[PDB]
Write a protein that binds this ligand. Structure first.
Ligand SMILES: CC(C)(C)c1ccc(N(C(=O)c2c[nH]cn2)[C@@H](C(=O)NC2CCCCC2)c2cccnc2)cc1
Ligand SMILES: CC(C)(C)c1ccc(N(C(=O)c2c[nH]cn2)[C@@H](C(=O)NC2CCCCC2)c2cccnc2)cc1
Ligand SMILES: [Cl-]
Ligand SMILES: [Cl-]
Ligand code: NA
Ligand code: NA
Lengths: 306, 305
C-alpha cells in the first residue's frame, strides 16, 4: 500500500561520480571504464560565455589542464575528445566500480532518477520526467552540472541525462550521454527560454490507474469517450495528445483494474471539468503526471484492491 | 533552483541488505559487521500470527532454521537472539561494506529516506516523515519487511527505522533498530489502527520558507502574530503546537528571507483560515509538511556526503 515518488537506488551511480576542474571552473563528471564524461562547457572561459568556440578552446588545452579527482585520488588525464556537447577525458585508471551500463536517449514523458552532485560528491536523489518542452523540473544549484539521470531496470544502469544548465524559469536543460541536447537548447549564455509546457496525459492516466489499484475509485464515472473527443477536450487544458500507442501502453493497467482505457479517459475529462471538490488522489490535490505506466507497474501491487 | 522531495544517496545502505528466510517466510535483513538485523516476526507461522509467544518460538528455533543470503552467497548463522522486536543473527562473516553508522531513534516530524527492498534486493528509495501518530506513509508491498530508513551525516549512516507491518489504512508501522516500536503497535495480527493524525507545523513553515527562497511570495502579508494566538489557530485546524524550540530551529530561514517566524506564522494562519484561493505553492495545492527545516537548508545549500 502507499504510493511515493520513488527513485532507483543510487549506489551504482555514486561509484561513478568524480570532480572535474579546468581553470577556475569545477563541475561533476561520470567515470565509466577509463573515460570521464562531462559537459564541454567546463572549458568555457568566464570572460566569454556568450559565443565560445569549443573546437578552438579545446585545441589549446593540454591533458594536465584537466584535474580529475575521484574521492581523494587524482586521476591522470591521458587524452581528450569532444562528442557533441560532451567532453570525454581518457584517464590512466579505469573505474573498478563501473556498473553494467548503457546510454539511452529518452522521449518526452519518460521518467528517470537524478543523482544531484556537487564537487564530485552526491547530495541527494530524486525522480524527474523529461517534460514535453524538453526541460526537466530539477533541483540543481550552481556547480551541479555533470550530474546524471538514469534508470536501473534489471541491474543495468541506463544513463539518459547529463545536466548542463539552468534556464530563466528555474527549470533545467541537458544532453544525453552522446552530448546531444534534449530540445533546442545550447551550452552558452543566450536568451533561450523554455517553451510553454504541457501535461503528460498518458502519465496522468497511469497514476489514476495506480489510485484504483490502491483502492480509490471516487473519480470514476458512468461515461466513455472516443479517443478523438478526448483529445479535443484535453488539449483545451494544455494536455498532450493521447495516441493509440499510449492507449496500447496502458493496456496492462486496464486489464488489471477492469477499467477500459477510454473509460479512464472519460474520468480524466470529468476531473478536468470539475476539480477534486476537496478530495485528494494518492495524497495529491493536483493531477500528477511524472509517473509513467511502467513506473506504476514497477511500484504497485499486481493485485487490485477491489 | 527548483525544489524536489529528495532522498539521501542510498549506496551505503544498499551494501548492507540481505535476504532472511525462516521456514516459508522471506523478508529483508540489515547486515552490519557480523550481525544481521531483521523483524522478529520472521519466526511466526500464520497460526502463531494471532498470539505469538516469541520467547517460546525463539527457544524452539536453532541457528540452522535461518537462511541468510547476501546476493548469491549464503551467510552461515552461528547464533541468534532477540532485542525487543528485532531478531539478531550472528553470522560468520563481517560485512566488508559496513559503513560508519549509528542507531538513532527519531521524533515525530523528522524525515528520513527509505530503501525499499524485496528478497534482499534494493528496489527503490523515497523520502518520508514520521507522522505525529507514529506511522509512516510509506510505499511497501508484501515482503518489504526489514527495509530500513536512514539519514546520512558526512560519511555516517544513522539508521532510524526498520519496517515491520501495514495498518488497515495502508500506512506503515515499524521500529528503531533496537526493536522498539514507533507508536502503540505490536507485531502480531490483531485489531490495530492508526490514530487520528495531525499536520507537522514546523515543517509546513520550513516549506513556506523554501517557497520564498524559490520566488513564491504571494502568501506573505503585513501582519505578525504571537505564539499563543497562532497555537490556538493550530489547534483548531489539527496542526501540531509550535514551540519556542521550533521557532529557534527555523531562525536561519527567518533571517535569510526577512520573514520572522511569527511573520511567517501570520501567513500560515491566513492560509489555514482562508485557503489558497485557487493558487499553488511550490507546485502543490496542499500545505506540505514532510520537509524539515534541515531538509530545506540542505537542499537549498547543496550539502554533500
Ligand atoms: C558556460 C555556460 C554554458 C554559459 C554555463 C554557465 C553556468 C552554468 N551553471 C553552473 O552552475 C556552472 C557552470 N560550470 C560550473 N557550474 C549554472 C547556470 O546554468 N547558470 C545559467 C545562468 C543564466 C545564463 C546561462 C547560465 C547552473 C545553476 C543552477 C543549476 N544548473 C546550472 C552552466 C553553464
Ligand atoms: C506476522 C505479522 C506481524 C502479523 C505480519 C504479517 C504480515 C506482514 N506483511 C508482510 O508482507 C510480511 C511478513 N513477513 C513477510 N512479509 C504485510 C502486513 O503487514 N500484513 C498485515 C495484514 C494485517 C494483519 C497484520 C499483517 C505487509 C504488507 C505490505 C507492507 N508491509 C507489510 C507483516 C507482519
Ligand atoms: Cl523513452
Ligand atoms: Cl511475546
Ligand atoms: Na556493528
Ligand atoms: Na506577515
Amino acid at each position: 500500500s502507499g504510493f511515493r515518488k520513488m527513485a532507483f537506488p543510487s549506489g551504482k551511480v555514486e561509484g561513478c561520480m568524480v570532480q572535474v576542474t579546468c581553470g577556475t571552473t569545477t563541475l561533476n563528471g561520470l567515470w565509466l571504464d577509463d573515460v570521464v564524461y562531462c559537459p564541454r562547457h567546463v572549458i568555457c572561459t568566464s570572460e566569454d560565455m556568450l559565443n565560445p568556440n569549443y573546437e578552438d578552446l579545446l585545441i589549446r588545452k593540454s591533458n594536465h589542464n584537466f584535474l580529475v579527482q575521484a574521492g581523494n585520488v587524482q586521476l591522470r588525464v591521458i587524452g581528450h575528445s569532444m562528442q557533441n556537447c560532451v567532453l570525454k577525458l581518457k584517464v590512466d585508471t579505469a573505474n573498478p566500480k563501473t556498473p553494467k551500463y548503457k546510454f539511452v536517449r529518452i522521449q518526452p514523458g519518460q521518467t528517470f532518477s537524478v543523482l544531484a552532485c556537487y564537487n564530485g560528491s552526491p547530495s541527494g536523489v530524486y525522480q524527474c520526467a523529461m517534460r514535453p518542452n524538453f526541460t526537466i523540473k530539477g533541483s540543481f544549484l550552481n556547480g551541479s552540472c555533470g550530474s546524471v539521470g538514469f534508470n536501473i531496470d534489471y541491474d543495468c544502469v541506463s544513463f539518459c541525462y547529463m545536466h548542463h544548465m539552468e534556464l530563466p524559469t528555474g527549470v533545467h536543460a541537458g544532453t544525453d550521454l552522446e552530448g546531444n541536447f534534449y530540445g533546442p537548447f545550447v551550452d552558452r549564455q543566450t536568451a533561450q527560454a523554455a517553451g510553454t509546457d504541457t501535461t503528460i496525459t498518458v502519465n496522468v492516466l497511469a497514476w489514476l490507474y495506480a489510485a484504483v489499484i490502491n483502492g480509490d475509485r471516487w473519480f470514476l464515472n458512468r461515461f466513455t469517450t472516443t479517443l478523438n473527443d478526448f483529445n479535443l477536450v484535453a488539449m483545451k487544458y494544455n494536455y498532450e495528445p493521447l495516441t493509440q500507442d499510449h492507449v496500447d501502453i496502458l493496456g496492462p493497467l486496464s486489464a488489471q483494474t477492469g477499467i477500459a482505457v477510454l473509460d479512464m479517459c472519460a474520468s480524466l475529462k470529468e476531473l478536468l471539468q470539475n476539480g477534486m471538490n476537496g478530495r485528494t488522489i494518492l495524497g495529491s490535490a493536483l493531477l500528477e503526471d511524472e509517473f509513467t505506466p511502467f513506473d506504476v507497474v514497477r511500484q504497485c501491487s499486481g493485485v487490485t484492491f477491489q
